[PDB]
Symmetry: C3
């Protein structure tokens, strides 16, 4: 029993292999707490301030549920820019130093990348980054990795297909970053070439020992993977090249025909929300894990709230 080594949860680079493993063990303990028919009091007396600068229902409710499942309570806003209705203006550092007097922990979702680290540096209470604009989304990365460990039973020696908009894929990028901290990992980059993964991730994996391989053929890669992590490709990413959007039409979808070629022990993941890139009849298959994945986000966020406030 000791203090959590992290003062804040901001970026994926904060985590090493052993810290991840320990957090995942705590998440399993949080699942036991959530399953119990007794109300937990671990965080009784603690207040979480949800500081969202835009509405983002799923992830906010996941945090607020985690706090209340542990016996803590919540202050919420999805209008953080509106500091006062009578005097215009808002400054992140002033909001933090004001709200930290009302709460014991801040969960912030800003619109600008880099805001989370500034808030952590300013606040004298722990801060969790719930989505740093277009930047880091660390608890989504943790729950993604945790879901793989939970569903497949291991993180060493697995094969993961990262599908969709990889060039601009916030979560596929951070998922590959955390998976590179484990051994004998193989990652498939499944995409159209114009939204293929960028070199910084490609070069970080190689220099990490991770084997990787690019493809345009999801149906082939699928049969060899433990995990198929799906994300959308927005039509706007193709610009004027509707010939390429017509040539990709139906080639990166997860549907029953794709499930038919996958191992019985592989899973489909999707951070949500989804468009048509996973058909509705996939949901009935036990390998459709994207809703168990969301539930794992509750356990992970319970773990971080607990560790940051009362330690190991």
């Amino acid at each position: 029993p000791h203090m959590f080594e992290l003062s804040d949860v901001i970026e994926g680079k904060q985590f090493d292999r052993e810290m991840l493993s320990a957090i995942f063990d705590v998440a399993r303990e949080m699942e036991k707490i959530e399953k119990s028919s007794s109300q937990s009091e671990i965080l009784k007396g603690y207040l979480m301030a949800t500081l969202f600068y835009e509405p983002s229902t799923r992830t906010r409710l996941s945090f607020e549920s985690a706090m209340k499942r542990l016996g803590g309570e919540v202050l919420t806003t999805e209008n953080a820019r509106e500091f006062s209705s009578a005097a215009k203006g808002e400054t992140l550092e002033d909001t933090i130093r004001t709200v930290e007097g009302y709460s014991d922990i801040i969960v912030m979702r800003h619109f600008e990348s880099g805001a989370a680290r500034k808030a952590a540096a300013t606040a004298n209470i722990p801060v969790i980054n719930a989505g740093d604009g277009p930047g880091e989304h660390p608890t989504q990365a943790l729950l993604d990795v945790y879901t793989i460990q939970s569903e497949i039973g291991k993180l060493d020696g697995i094969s993961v297909a990262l599908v969709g908009d990889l060039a601009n894929g916030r979560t596929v990028r951070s998922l590959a970053y955390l998976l590179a901290k484990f051994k004998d990992v193989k990652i498939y980059f499944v995409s159209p070439e114009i939204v293929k993964m960028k070199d910084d991730i490609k070069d970080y994996l190689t220099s990490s020992g991770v084997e990787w391989e690019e493809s345009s053929d999801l149906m082939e890669v699928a049969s060899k993977c433990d995990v198929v992590y799906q994300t959308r490709i927005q039509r706007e990413r193709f610009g004027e090249r509707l010939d390429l959007y017509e040539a990709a039409r139906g080639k990166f979808i997860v549907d029953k025909d794709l499930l038919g070629v996958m191992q019985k022990k592989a899973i489909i993941m999707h951070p949500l929300p989804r468009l048509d890139e996973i058909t509705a009849d996939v949901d009935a298959d036990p390998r459709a894990a994207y809703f168990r994945q969301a539930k794992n986000g509750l356990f992970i966020r319970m773990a971080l709230l607990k560790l940051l406030l009362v330690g190991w």
Copy 2:
């Protein structure tokens, strides 16, 4: 002591005479709980997810108060369409299967009729329909009927005037539907002809044994009724016929002159919010029951939350 026979609260057709009577008895028990100076713990450890797709303050707070008066806690949103601020799109069934991992019961207010039943079919936790777009609003119907039983002392053998926009009146339609399950009921349809009640309700009552009668003369009908259930008529319902809107001007209002012709034991009901169809000086009369009616909504919604989560 046993399980509630309803898995969800969606539509008025789910309820028969005896179920209504039993629910109303539970609502009376909930009133005793709310009146107590001790905090209830009946729903300690349970979380209610308020899934509103549009802001609707009164009815949301009625639900959230009911949960907290019973010792449960709440997750709220009036922006349910905004599943994620970073990835556009929302799908009802995906929202339900995501949020049900954070909560024990869902109270949803969608914008499209039929959404509540789909959510119930998808969710593995109970669902309450708090307003199904232009469709069912069952807890408003229950609290309307409960208010009559509470104020008049009976439901068999009463006379109720349904006033206002009856053709498109969501709540007058469902109120008449539930009242038709009791005996020797008489219903007055008080309206301009162009917003008169529709045949489906007229034919369901007749085939239910309920006696009914249409009128354009509220001042006559009022003196014969136990209940005057008032609703607005929006000027837009008249279209271009401002001659009819001028001919109806002042004819379907509840004012002191109308109270002067009503029995001392009759009541005024209004689901709220009201416009000018009930004058402010009616409020001081003990027969103005529309605020006691709103309070009864708390008791009814306490009862449903309790029954759905812990049974009879």
Copy 3:
């Protein structure tokens, strides 16, 4: 131990010197409660309804934190005008008489001055005015005065500089009003002439025994004051006179050069949010009290909630 002499908290004129002093003593007790590692239950079983007609994050969270630090619970809205999503319209008195059935105390922030007093007159539960449109903001006045007493150690015999837009300054006006209830007070009105304080305050102070003096020279006045209460001047207040806005540019700012001329025992206050009228490097100085000031708002609002619901 007895009943709070105030049924509601609406206007500064409700408070006399002795009531203020007693409230400030309770606020000090509330600070002890907030500091404790035990969850308070003083307001267990009580519900606060936050009825905000516009979003105003800081002050809402200050109230909602105060309630939860005392063990009470909260119903919130920043969309109070949206009584129902299906039927348009909202009437203050109908909202109050509806929501008071769901709660034990109402904290309202309306958009129109005079709304708070109407709500108090209508409600059978206590009401706190959290910002009456352009009108009274009493808890901000209380926390402003309380901050001075807490930081300087006294209210009799002090010198306070009120800086910024004084003509339209909601909080400088009410701060001077409450300070005039103490002895040997001296107030400096530091402003451009076109946003100078108005006669009603100037004449109320004189008739109160308070000495006052107007100035355009913050750097002089600062060295003689116990308190420098800063507020912005919006460029729009100058209208077309950009020559005056250019002549005032840099003359009413709080910066390190101004701190260099102030007593070591003086403080900087600012109700927040601020623009550029306090430079960021002032924050590191122990005399920058605007964030301790916000924290004092929590204690004051805890005190009022406690007194109004359970008395002295």
